[PDB]
Amino acid sequence: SGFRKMAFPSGKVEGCMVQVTCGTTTLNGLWLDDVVYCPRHVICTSEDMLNPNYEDLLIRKSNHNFLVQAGNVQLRVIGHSMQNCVLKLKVDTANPKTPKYKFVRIQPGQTFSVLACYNGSPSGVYQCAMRPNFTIKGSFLNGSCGSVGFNICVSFCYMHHMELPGVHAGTDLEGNFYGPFVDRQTAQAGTDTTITVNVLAWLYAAVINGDRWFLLNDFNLVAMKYNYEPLTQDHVDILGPLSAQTGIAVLDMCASLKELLQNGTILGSALLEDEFTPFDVVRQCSGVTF
Amino acid sequence: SGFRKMAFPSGKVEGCMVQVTCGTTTLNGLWLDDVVYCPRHVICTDMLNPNYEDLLIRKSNHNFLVQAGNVQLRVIGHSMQNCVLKLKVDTANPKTPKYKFVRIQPGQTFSVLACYNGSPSGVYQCAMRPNFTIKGSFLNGSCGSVGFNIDCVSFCYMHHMELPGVHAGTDLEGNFGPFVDRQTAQAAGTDTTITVNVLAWLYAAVINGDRWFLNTTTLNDFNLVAMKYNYEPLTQDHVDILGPLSAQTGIAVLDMCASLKELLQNGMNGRTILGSALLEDEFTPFDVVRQC
Numbered sequence: 001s002g003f004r005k006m007a008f009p010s011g012k013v014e015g016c017m018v019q020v021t022c023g024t025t026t027l028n029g030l031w032l033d034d035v036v037y038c039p040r041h042v043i044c045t046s047e048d049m050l051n052p053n054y055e056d057l058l059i060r061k062s063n064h065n066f067l068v069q070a071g072n073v074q075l076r077v078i079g080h081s082m083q084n085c086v087l088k089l090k091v092d093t094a095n096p097k098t099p100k101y102k103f104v105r106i107q108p109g110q111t112f113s114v115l116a117c118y119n120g121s122p123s124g125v126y127q128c129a130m131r132p133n134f135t136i137k138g139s140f141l142n143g144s145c146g147s148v149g150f151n152i153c154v155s156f157c158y159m160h161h162m163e164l165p166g167v168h169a170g171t172d173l174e175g176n177f178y179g180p181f182v183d184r185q186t187a188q189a190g191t192d193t194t195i196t197v198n199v200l201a202w203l204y205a206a207v208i209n210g211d212r213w214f215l216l217n218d219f220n221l222v223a224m225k226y227n228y229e230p231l232t233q234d235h236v237d238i239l240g241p242l243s244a245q246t247g248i249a250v251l252d253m254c255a256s257l258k259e260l261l262q263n264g265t266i267l268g269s270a271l272l273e274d275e276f277t278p279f280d281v282v283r284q285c286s287g288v289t290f
Numbered sequence: 291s292g293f294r295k296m297a298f299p300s301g302k303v304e305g306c307m308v309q310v311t312c313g314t315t316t317l318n319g320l321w322l323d324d325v326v327y328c329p330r331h332v333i334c335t336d337m338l339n340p341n342y343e344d345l346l347i348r349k350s351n352h353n354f355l356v357q358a359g360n361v362q363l364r365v366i367g368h369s370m371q372n373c374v375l376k377l378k379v380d381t382a383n384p385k386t387p388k389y390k391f392v393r394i395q396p397g398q399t400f401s402v403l404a405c406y407n408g409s410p411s412g413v414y415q416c417a418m419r420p421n422f423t424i425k426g427s428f429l430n431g432s433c434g435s436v437g438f439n440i441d442c443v444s445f446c447y448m449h450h451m452e453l454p455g456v457h458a459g460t461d462l463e464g465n466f467g468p469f470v471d472r473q474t475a476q477a478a479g480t481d482t483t484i485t486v487n488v489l490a491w492l493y494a495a496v497i498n499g500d501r502w503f504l505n506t507t508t509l510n511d512f513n514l515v516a517m518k519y520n521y522e523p524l525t526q527d528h529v530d531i532l533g534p535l536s537a538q539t540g541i542a543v544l545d546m547c548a549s550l551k552e553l554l555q556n557g558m559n560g561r562t563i564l565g566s567a568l569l570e571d572e573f574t575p576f577d578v579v580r581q582c
């Protein structure tokens with residue numbers, strides 16, 4: 001019983017957090033095998049950010065211009081390359097704490113844990129959603145760049161690159177930004193919408209936990225007026241297991257959310273929560289371990 | 291910027307989680323040095339009204355199976371301290387962090403590593419309610435999961451029971467609120483809001499640009515309003531702990547108290563504060579300074 005915003009256990013990722021330094025600029029890096037991944041803007045001076053030509057800036061930098069420290073020890077860099085917006089620094093030492101891992105590019109609406117890090121050291125962990133406009137609503141201070149988001153074998157899906165004038169943007173671990181954003185300090189995020197299939201998953205969580213007072217082409221007409229993402233049959237199939245668990249059909253739950261949108265606590269929140277996936281609900285409500 | 295409910299990184303606690311089985315009952319234990327800690331109800335079949343001493347008598351060391359991953363630890367001693375079982379094993383946990391056992395005060399927050407069969411499931415941040423319950427996420431099998439703060443790991447909580455939807459447990463010496471480890475109906479006090487935490491969170495909001503609620507008063511005047519709305523009384527100690535936030539924001543603590551009184555008397559009008567449509571009280575002033 002109970003429902004909470006739950007993050008994955010962060011131990012396997014803490015053992016991969018190193019501190020990358022280049023000139024004055026120091027940020028966080030991800031040490032897996034004999035390679036360290038970090039935002040390529042580590043090579044940028046303060047004046048460089050306004051309009052960096054990365055290839056030119058990187059060419060002016062050599063292997064020894066990169067200080068990689070794992071806790072107390074300093075690793076030796078024997079190679080460097082740029083993959084899209086991430087820097088790959090080959091080191092002479094495989095990380096002995098490298099977990100089984102994969103790199104994954106998630107889709108809008110999916111969630112993950114962020115281990116927020118400063119100077120290579122963990123600060124805290126929290127759960128996040130990739131918004132439909134490909135930002136995330138996190139808690140990121142200057143210095144947190146390079147922290148990663150992940151699901152758990154660890155599937156890394158996000159590296160933090162920038163704080164916008166109060167949401168945040170970043171890349172997958174191949175360095176491609178999520179969204180239209182570029183790693184340059186110029187003003188840059190379109191209309192965000194609410195993740196409908198996620199709100200429906202959370203209403204099922206509510207019913208599972210005893211909170212039931214609120215109990216398709218038609219539904220999308222309503223949701224569109226309220227800046228809710230349209231609900232597709234793929235989304236209905238995803239909610240199938242929750243429906244079979246609760247004995248409440250999917251279109252029945254949508255009918256419930258319609259009235260909620262027009263008329264205005266559920267699981268102790270006064271707003272409709274859209275940062276729980278259907279997999280999140282099943283995971284938390286059936287106690288999946290790792 | 292931004293402001294999330296944030297847990298502590300959990301790797302040090304992950305390394306201490308094991309599985310403890312006694313007869314049929316399996317739950318989680320906490321393995322530090324050569325001792326495994328778990329709820330004493332691991333020995334109950336019973337449980338409507340268990341005589342714990344008499345149930346313990348019927349148990350020997352080999353009736354306790356303790357697994358740490360795939361490794362089976364050998365139990366060479368066992369004792370009951372208050373409501374927790376302490377199992378002496380033949381191996382000290384190599385991954386033992388620097389640690390303390392602490393009893394936190396109502397209103398302090400901690401991180402809970404939820405666990406099943408000795409394996410981590412997830413981490414989330416919690417507050418000890420003024421009525422000494424916690425509003426957690428615990429299924430059957432989660433008993434023995436622990437709550438902790440980090441500076442050195444300070445263990446403050448071990449989970450024992452779900453009341454007929456909130457949660458109750460003990461410190462790591464096994465002292466529970468008024469609750470006992472028996473399946474009888476049990477009443478928590480009326481719960482109240484943690485005023486000093488609400489204020490800390492309003493400061494957090496101002497640091498992050500949410501100012502719309504800024505509108506003075508006296509400690510005694512505010513307290514009269516706090517009582518009517520089931521808010522914990524505010525003390526000069528509380529005002530003192532908010533000092534650093536006041537200096538950062540340049541908003542006097544009693545000025546923030548008046549804005550909150552206004553929020554308490556007028557409601558929120560459908561507006562939000564840090565993405566919440568209610569007043570959040572599970573952040574301490576320390577939590578706010580740490581995050582910010």
Ligand SMILES: *C(=O)c1ncc(Br)cc1OCc1ccc2ccccc2c1
Binds near residue numbers: 027161162
């Ligand atoms: C971000 O995590 C970070 N930490 C430490 C430092 Br010294 C710099 C950091 O990023 C600042 C940054 C870099 C690039 C940008 C492009 C566009 C807008 C804002 C930024 C900010």
Ligand SMILES: *C(=O)c1ncc(Br)cc1OCc1ccc2ccccc2c1
Binds near residue numbers: 314
């Ligand atoms: C608790 O999470 C738990 N996990 C696994 C098992 Br096999 C049993 C568990 O609790 C049973 C229990 C213990 C103490 C109680 C006290 C008061 C009411 C109910 C219980 C239930």
